Design a protein around this ligand. Structure first.
Ligand SMILES: *CC(=O)NCCCC1CCN(C(=O)C2(Nc3ccc(Cl)cc3)CCOCC2)CC1
Ligand SMILES: *CC(=O)NCCCC1CCN(C(=O)C2(Nc3ccc(Cl)cc3)CCOCC2)CC1
Ligand SMILES: [Mg+2]
Ligand SMILES: [Mg+2]
Ligand SMILES: [Mg+2]
Ligand SMILES: [Mg+2]
Ligand SMILES: [Mg+2]
Ligand SMILES: [Mg+2]
Lengths: 236, 5, 236, 5
């Protein structure tokens, strides 16, 4: 790897600089380099890794959706034939997106997940696995689409099982996992009732535990609870 | 799109 | 070039798609491919080329300024030594910026400018030459800084001379050139009085010619006149 | 920063 000659600490320092400069591709490359050193990640380092790739793939997803919409419009009745260019460019963006997802999944599989023994770390990594299979599923149209969807489901479910046993209902990682798995149900698995039920139960169980929290923890938990509420409002 | 984190 | 196998028309089509998807690096690569076909550009194609590279280099400049500010703060009294990483990463971004500028300047020199005979095209390309030498000058600190500044000045001056002889004072290309050359004076050449005088005379001469214009041309000209006014307000 | 186009 091009980052093999750089110190782990320098890669982390530069990831933080890249974040400040909104250079998320660089941030992701630095964090990949840091993961490939082979040492486990701290909480802060997990956050850096996730922020970097979320921002890179988020931009790719937004671009893919623009192109896919243009392509769909081209295939309607009355639309003039404009040749293969829209499909080609949508495929180009799609292939790059898939590459990023495969890169993240590769880091998780070699070897972040297997070395993660604490509940927070294991849940966080399994959530990420679900997320990146979900992004693959968004663009899947072939023989493997069912298996990609099931890979996302399985990762989210394992994370959910750990989270419920090991973390309080207000824990931000538990909350974020539930938020994202609920979106998986609604958008990917064609299970809107499951999505709504999960968001509602997660919200309600968190509400009942807020009394245990400091002011700072309350702020963290309630921010994600509001995201659950926002989705419920969109869906009901 | 719905919120994710 | 990786775009050598793609039709010119397809490159232009894909540049427009990339713009819609806010994929400016791709947009720039497509337009570079189109220029390298060797045919002159149309007005619309010149706009695509300029938009693509403006957006790519604009993002690089913003990132460079963030990093340069962090670096400057690191070199103040009382700041803790944090090693070579800030300088290294600022240099990385700087080198990439310089590369983009060199790419644009290369397209202009081989062979856009020499084949441009109409005033609008020649002025537009010479303005771009001034702009990309100006971006090089922003980051220059060495033996060649004076020569880089003079390269920008010379390109802008040639454009100005053509624009005044060949175009009305409301022409958007003439106006945009004057806006940018005025910023060159203020920010690069340490000549704020020249910057102010140029912006003011350009504004006033345009105002006196608005009566000749259609509603649509009036809208185009007055938008850039307002930018001149905005700069004058900042500077006085 | 000042406006440029
Ligand atoms: C100790 C450990 O493993 N930490 C990993 C990072 C977890 C933190 C938790 C707080 N947090 C957030 O609340 C926001 N983002 C996310 C929340 C939950 C998950 Cl699973 C992922 C991201 C911060 C940004 O706004 C949304 C909430 C950051 C990550
Ligand atoms: C015929 C020809 O050579 N055309 C090249 C493209 C010129 C157009 C003019 C209109 N225009 C603008 O007004 C805006 N941008 C620029 C203006 C002037 C210059 Cl020299 C460059 C760009 C549009 C975006 O907002 C700012 C004004 C687009 C370019
Ligand atoms: Mg070491
Ligand atoms: Mg495909
Ligand atoms: Mg359940
Ligand atoms: Mg051909
Ligand atoms: Mg340098
Ligand atoms: Mg003069």
């Amino acid at each position: 790897g091009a980052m093999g000659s750089m110190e782990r600490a320098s890669l982390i320092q530069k990831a933080k600089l890249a974040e400040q400069a909104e250079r998320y591709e660089d941030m992701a490359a630095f964090m990949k380099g840091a993961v490939e050193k082979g040492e486990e990640l701290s909480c802060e380092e997990r956050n850096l890794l996730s922020v970097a790739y979320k921002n890179v793939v988020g931009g790719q997803r937004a671009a893919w959706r623009v192109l896919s919409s243009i392509e769909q419009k081209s295939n309607e009745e009355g639309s003039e034939e404009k040749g293969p260019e829209v499909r080609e460019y949508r495929e180009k963006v799609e292939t790059e997106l898939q590459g990023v997802c495969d890169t993240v999944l590769g880091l998780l599989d070699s070897h972040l997940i297997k070395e993660a023994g604490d509940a927070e770390s294991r849940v966080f990594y399994l959530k990420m696995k679900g997320d990146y299979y979900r992004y693959l599923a968004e663009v899947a149209t072939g023989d493997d689409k069912k298996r990609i969807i099931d890979s996302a489901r399985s990762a989210y479910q394992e994370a959910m099982d750990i989270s419920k046993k090991e973390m309080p209902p207000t824990n931000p990682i538990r909350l974020g996992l539930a938020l994202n798995f609920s979106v998986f149900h609604y958008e990917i698995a064609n299970s809107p009732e499951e999505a709504i039920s999960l968001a509602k139960t997660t919200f309600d169980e968190a509400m009942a535990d807020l009394h245990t929290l400091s002011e700072d923890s309350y702020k963290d938990s309630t921010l994600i609870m509001q995201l659950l509420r926002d989705n419920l409002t969109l869906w009901t | 799109f719905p919120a994710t984190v």
